[PDB]
Amino acid sequence: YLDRKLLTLEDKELGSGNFGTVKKGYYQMKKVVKTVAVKILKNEANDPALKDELLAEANVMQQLDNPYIVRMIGICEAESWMLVMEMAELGPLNKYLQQNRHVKDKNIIELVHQVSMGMKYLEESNFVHRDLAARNVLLVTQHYAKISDFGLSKALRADENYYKAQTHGKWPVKWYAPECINYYKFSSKSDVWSFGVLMWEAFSYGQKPYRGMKGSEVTAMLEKGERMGCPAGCPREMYDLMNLCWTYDVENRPGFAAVELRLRNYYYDV
Numbered sequence: 001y002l003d004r005k006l007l008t009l010e011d012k013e014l015g016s017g018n019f020g021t022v023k024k025g026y027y028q029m030k031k032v033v034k035t036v037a038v039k040i041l042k043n044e045a046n047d048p049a050l051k052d053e054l055l056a057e058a059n060v061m062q063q064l065d066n067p068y069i070v071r072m073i074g075i076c077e078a079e080s081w082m083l084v085m086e087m088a089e090l091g092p093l094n095k096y097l098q099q100n101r102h103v104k105d106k107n108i109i110e111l112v113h114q115v116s117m118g119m120k121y122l123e124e125s126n127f128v129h130r131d132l133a134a135r136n137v138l139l140v141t142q143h144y145a146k147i148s149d150f151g152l153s154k155a156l157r158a159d160e161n162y163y164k165a166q167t168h169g170k171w172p173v174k175w176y177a178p179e180c181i182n183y184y185k186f187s188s189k190s191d192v193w194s195f196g197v198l199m200w201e202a203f204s205y206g207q208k209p210y211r212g213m214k215g216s217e218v219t220a221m222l223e224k225g226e227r228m229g230c231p232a233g234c235p236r237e238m239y240d241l242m243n244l245c246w247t248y249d250v251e252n253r254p255g256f257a258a259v260e261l262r263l264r265n266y267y268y269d270v
């Protein structure tokens with residue numbers, strides 16, 4: 001738990017949501033001050049499900065340590081409940097690509113490879129992300145991406161490779177694999193499907209997937225074996241990798257170790 005007197009928040013808001021606000025701030029470390037992004041719960045954190053999601057996200061972040069995952073500084077209980085993270089200055093990947101339409105193919109491949117390295121680590125650590133979308137990739141620099149938003153993330157049981165939800169909740173269905181929608185089962189292979197959607201978003205410069213379709217229509221499209229087309233100018237090898245991520249059968253779909261290998265821009269052995 002952090003010291004409010006060591007935290008300073010900017011008057012301006014960095015972003016906003018139904019949970020409350022996101023503010024840029026500064027936190028006093030051993031010697032230097034560190035730039036932070038702070039999620040601040042609305043109405044003094046009176047929504048108990050908001051408070052519980054904040055604490056669950058913090059509990060997951062405390063266990064993670066990887067260069068391609070946003071680092072948590074901690075929780076601050078003061079005027080409201082705050083979750084303090086190391087600032088990724090350039091913000092969400094989808095907004096960045098919407099605003100920077102000339103980012104080169106090699107650079108997009110570099111960034112999605114970094115996401116695959118963080119996901120390979122999460123898979124090895126037996127956590128499922130469950131909200132892997134371009135909006136949840138944050139840029140430290142134009143050449144360094146980190147994964148964020150672990151609000152739906154789960155630590156897998158020791159005897160299973162999936163988290164079983166009781167039924168369908170309010171979910172980012174356009175990023176979910178068929179086994180998620182049909183059987184409520186979430187594995188690292190389910191995150192690989194989401195990663196294929198994230199890839200499609202990155203090469204479509206932050207366009208939304210399955211434009212104009214209802215969730216039920218997406219499910220029927222996928223069950224028919226249909227998939228989104230190749231984004232204009234997307235390298236064929238990257239579109240082929242999206243299609244492999246969108247393998248219907250969870251057993252035949254690659255895991256992140258296999259996907260990360262396919263995103264390397266150097267010779268290697270399997």
Ligand SMILES: CCN(c1nc(Nc2ccc3c(c2)S(=O)(=O)NC3)ncc1F)c1cccc2[nH]ncc12
Binds near residue numbers: 037083086090138150
């Ligand atoms: C996306 C908000 N965000 C961060 N945000 C940034 N940078 C950042 C930088 C710029 C902008 C934004 C965020 S915005 O709010 O989406 N709009 C502009 N860096 C690290 C961050 F951790 C967060 C803060 C606290 C808890 C969090 N959980 N998941 C994300 C998150």
